[PDB]
Amino acid sequence: EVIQKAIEENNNFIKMAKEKLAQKMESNKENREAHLAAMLERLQEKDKHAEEVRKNKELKE
Amino acid sequence: MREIVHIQAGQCGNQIGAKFWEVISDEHGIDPTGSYHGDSDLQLERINVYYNEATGNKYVPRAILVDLEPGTMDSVRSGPFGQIFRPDNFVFGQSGAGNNWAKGHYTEGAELVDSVLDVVRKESESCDCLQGFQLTHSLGGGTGSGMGTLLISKIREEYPDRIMNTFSVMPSPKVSDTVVEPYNATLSVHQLVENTDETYCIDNEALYDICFRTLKLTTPTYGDLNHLVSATMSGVTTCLRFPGQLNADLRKLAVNMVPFPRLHFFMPGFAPLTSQYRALTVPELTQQMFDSKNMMAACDPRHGRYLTVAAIFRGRMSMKEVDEQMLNVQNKNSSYFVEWIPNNVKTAVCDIPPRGLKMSATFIGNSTAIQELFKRISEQFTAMFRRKAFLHWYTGEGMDEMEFTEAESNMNDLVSEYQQYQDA
Ligand SMILES: Nc1nc2c(ncn2[C@@H]2O[C@H](COP(=O)(O)OP(=O)(O)O)[C@@H](O)[C@H]2O)c(=O)[nH]1
Ligand SMILES: COc1ccc(-c2[nH]nc3c2-c2cc(OC)c(OC)c(OC)c2CC3)cc1
Numbered sequence: 001e002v003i004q005k006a007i008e009e010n011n012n013f014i015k016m017a018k019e020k021l022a023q024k025m026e027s028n029k030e031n032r033e034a035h036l037a038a039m040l041e042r043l044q045e046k047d048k049h050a051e052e053v054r055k056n057k058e059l060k061e
Numbered sequence: 062m063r064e065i066v067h068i069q070a071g072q073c074g075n076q077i078g079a080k081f082w083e084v085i086s087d088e089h090g091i092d093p094t095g096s097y098h099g100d101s102d103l104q105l106e107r108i109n110v111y112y113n114e115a116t117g118n119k120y121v122p123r124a125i126l127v128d129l130e131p132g133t134m135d136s137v138r139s140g141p142f143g144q145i146f147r148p149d150n151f152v153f154g155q156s157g158a159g160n161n162w163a164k165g166h167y168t169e170g171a172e173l174v175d176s177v178l179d180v181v182r183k184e185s186e187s188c189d190c191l192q193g194f195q196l197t198h199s200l201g202g203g204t205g206s207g208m209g210t211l212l213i214s215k216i217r218e219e220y221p222d223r224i225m226n227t228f229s230v231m232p233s234p235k236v237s238d239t240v241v242e243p244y245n246a247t248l249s250v251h252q253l254v255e256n257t258d259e260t261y262c263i264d265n266e267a268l269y270d271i272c273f274r275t276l277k278l279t280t281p282t283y284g285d286l287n288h289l290v291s292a293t294m295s296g297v298t299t300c301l302r303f304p305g306q307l308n309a310d311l312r313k314l315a316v317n318m319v320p321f322p323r324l325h326f327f328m329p330g331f332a333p334l335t336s337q338y339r340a341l342t343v344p345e346l347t348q349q350m351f352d353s354k355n356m357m358a359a360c361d362p363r364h365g366r367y368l369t370v371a372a373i374f375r376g377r378m379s380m381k382e383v384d385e386q387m388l389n390v391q392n393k394n395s396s397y398f399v400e401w402i403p404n405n406v407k408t409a410v411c412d413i414p415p416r417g418l419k420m421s422a423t424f425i426g427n428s429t430a431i432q433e434l435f436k437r438i439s440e441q442f443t444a445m446f447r448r449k450a451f452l453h454w455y456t457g458e459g460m461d462e463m464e465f466t467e468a469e470s471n472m473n474d475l476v477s478e479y480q481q482y483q484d485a
């Protein structure tokens with residue numbers, strides 16, 4: 001019982017490590033790209049704005 | 062023809078085992094090559110008890126060298142008599158047990174134990190009539206302590222009606238490898254109480270003091286300590302190795318030394334303590350060997366009572382004088398022997414002394430003051446275990462706290478069992 005417990009706890013420690021690592025890389029890639037998603041979408045309301053100002057300038061005559 | 066299988070286990074086990082075999086191979090006329098070159102033939106009458114017969118009938122010890130690292134064992138076999146040991150009888154792993162009882166008993170030792178029992182089986186199958194096993198080991202390390210008591214658990218299983226007999230070195234803070242020693246040793250003692258018939262308690266505290274106070278060695282080495290042990294061990298076993306009116310075997314010895322099966326831890330003593338040109342006179346032999354300063358276990362015999370005693374004198378001397386002096390020490394000090402075991406002191410004499418000493422006397426005492434040793438180890442244990450300190454080294458190998466309190470318990474009981482017979 002003792003040696004199969006030393007084995008079981010070494011394995012559960014590897015297990016949880018393996019998982020805590022995988023779960024954090026997934027939360028990180030998500031969070032990082034959401035911030036790049038958020039950053040680019042910000043820049044594109046600037047692109048869409050840079051035209052409503054240019055198109056507005058044609059609406060004169 | 063009553064052989065013993067000797068097993069030395071661990072660092073301390075195999076270092077002490079090593080000197081014991083050179084000490085007594087000198088006593089039996091065997092050279093470092095295993096060849097007999099002695100004068101007498103009393104050197105060869107009980108030879109079969111410790112040595113198997115060989116090539117052109119050389120003598121190989123009936124010894125099994127066990128460790129979980131090779132370091133000590135390479136050292137043994139490259140040492141003096143290291144050639145006499147049967148190379149097949151060198152059983153060793155590689156990882157070591159890290160001064161960790163659990164590694165010796167449950168994980169690392171568990172992996173190696175089967176290979177050892179293969180050697181014990183081939184050593185013991187070659188025995189017209191095997192009588193028992195003697196194990197040498199410390200109890201504060203990992204291999205000799207944890208694996209050694211595992212080996213005893215197993216040998217008892219395969220050989221339940223043989224005598225199991227150990228020489229066990231107790232840790233002491235004065236001479237300590239690591240801080241976990243009281244743990245390793247409390248766990249070994251729980252085993253020894255159940256699975257041995259006799260254990261000689263060699264305390265490393267007492268060996269240090271004898272070396273410092275008595276032998277005047279300012280800073281003793283382990284070799285200086287094992288000098289005292291290989292002399293006591295030669296002493297304790299001279300009846301098994303030499304013929305006498307005493308037909309001494311392990312079972313008769315245990316029958317008369319052990320009144321209660323758990324109370325089988327003996328206080329060895331030796332005299333004279335040497336590291337010398339006037340042989341001691343018999344009156345001094347017997348005064349010295351009963352002096353607390355000549356005990357190997359670091360308990361005061363005047364703090365308890367002798368359940369039983371076995372003394373042996375080596376040399377040619379007045380057989381009547383040892384009778385007289387032995388009988389006289391009992392009445393100078395009858396307050397310290399139990400009234401309810403008549404004739405509890407027994408004395409042998411051997412005409413062949415140890416190397417270098419013309420007259421020597423070795424003492425084996427089943428005293429209730431051995432309780433001091435377990436009280437000592439128990440205080441240390443509790444001191445750490447109340448704060449569960451250093452336990453992770455063990456829970457990391459499967460052990461549970463519960464196994465520890467059980468071992469604390471069984472040893473505190475053994476201390477109670479010893480106190481109750483000090484009062485009778
Ligand atoms: N008397 C004596 N004690 C020793 C010797 N070597 C180690 N010890 C003691 O043994 C205990 C450590 O166990 P050790 O034999 O080194 O570890 P193991 O190899 O895992 O069995 C400590 O209490 C040391 O004081 C030795 O040669 N002689
Ligand atoms: C307390 O009363 C008794 C004690 C021992 C015996 C006995 N019976 N048979 C033997 C022994 C015996 C005694 C030994 O010491 C005298 C002895 O030497 C260490 C010794 O050598 C190991 C032995 C083994 C041979 C009998 C009564």
Ligand SMILES: [Ca+2]
Nearest residue numbers: 156168169172
């Ligand atoms: Ca291993």
Ligand SMILES: [Mg+2]
Nearest residue numbers: 072073202238
């Ligand atoms: Mg060591």
